[PDB]
Copies of this chain bind each other. A is one copy, B any other.
Amino acid sequence: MKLPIHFYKPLAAGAPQPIRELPVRPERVIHFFPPHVEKIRARIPEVAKQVDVLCGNLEDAIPIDAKEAARAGFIEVARNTDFGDTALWVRVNALNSPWVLDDIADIVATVGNKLDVMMIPKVEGPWDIHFVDQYLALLEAKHQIQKPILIHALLETAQGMMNLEAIAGASPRMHGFSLGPADLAASRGMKTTRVGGGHPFYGVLADPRPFYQQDLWHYTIARMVDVAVAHGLRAFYGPFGDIKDEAACEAQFRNAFLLGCTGAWSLAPNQIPIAKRVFSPDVNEVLFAKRILDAMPDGSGVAMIDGKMQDDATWKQAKVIVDLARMIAKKDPELAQAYGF
């Protein structure tokens, strides 16, 4: 709705200048953790090094009794821990809840200069983003935050799916989208208690009899990807609830990856290597991106490579995945040999 002339203006005197390009960094796994449980908080600095992104959770799966405790716990661990190359996110409570006003406000007050991305659940339309963008801009000015805190929208209501284009366009803070398969099923009335992969009842019956199961989430992921990529945002697969079935987890993660998602959530330590292995950049795309960078050294002009003309749009897309691959190659030696770094 906002005209480009005004789109990148900060929304408060003293707020950091809005971002023009989303920051490039590894986002292969987003590891949730319950911040009100002490034993988990103690292992967090060691866990922090095993993940690309660490995300404190304050909304779903936190008992109502523990809401205030999860907030203090998140501020506590974020205070004392240096997260190095790992990104730090938090999922706050829904915008109609009694906790979201103090959630956002105190987290910016105490750890704002360490928060990279704030995850907003149950987004229904661009108005939700409009609130959070202005609220953040004012808190950023009050507490003198240096970097703009980005917005990450959880895509888990039927209205969010309908309003997807408007949500993606609602703010220069937008980082991307996470599909929430359980909430989105409840919202749509999909008839399943599952959080993730296939369903035995969803299939095609052969003619006279073999039964071929079908992907429940094809339309949903394809739609999320197309809208995200068109806005320069990133799409993510959210939770896979069957923590034990690592094969089904890998199959679901890889499906998201093959349609174009950047990473996936992990709800338990054992899903962390699954997300890292599935969402690692494809070797042959990195290697082709390096030819593009080599063909257009300063990023301008026209070049061909294998009968295909390279432009400014391909150079910037190539530049993103090579920078990302270098950052991955710096944490894992086996990948560094595969990308050539």
Contacts and interface: CB of A to CB of B under 8 A. Distances in A.
Given A193-B314, A203-B251, A11 B95 contact: yes
Interface string A297-326: 010111110111111111011111100000
A341 interface: no
A190 B259 contact: yes
Nearest to A239: B309
A72 interface: no
Given A130-B127, A142-B101, A304 B64 contact: yes
A312 B125 contact: no
Interface stretch (A43-51, A75-83, A110-118, A158-166): A158-166
B309 A158 contact: no
Interface in A185-228: 185-193, 195, 197-216, 218-220, 222-223, 225-227
A13 B311 contact: yes
A146 interface: no
B63 A300 contact: yes
A307 B204 contact: no
Given A13-B302, A205-B198, A214-B215, A158 B229 contact: yes
A213 B100 CA distance: 42
Interface in A54-106: 59-64, 66, 93-98, 100-101
A135 B131 CA distance: 7
Contacts of A52: none
A211 B251 contact: yes
Contacts of A311: 13, 60-61, 94, 96-97, 182
Interface of A: 1-14, 20-21, 34, 59-64, 66, 93-98, 100-101, 124-128, 130-131, 133-135, 137-139, 141-142, 156-159, 161-163, 165-166, 169-170, 172, 180, 182-183, 185-193, 195, 197-216, 218-220, 222-223, 225-227, 229-232, 239, 241-245, 247-248, 251-252, 254-255, 257-260, 262, 267-268, 281-282, 285, 288-289, 292, 298, 300-304, 306-314, 316-321
19 contacts: A1-B163, A3-B231, A4-B4, A12-B98, A13-B97, A34-B302, A60-B307, A60-B312, A64-B303, A185-B317, A188-B229, A202-B255, A203-B215, A204-B255, A206-B213, A208-B247, A218-B219, A244-B306, A268-B309
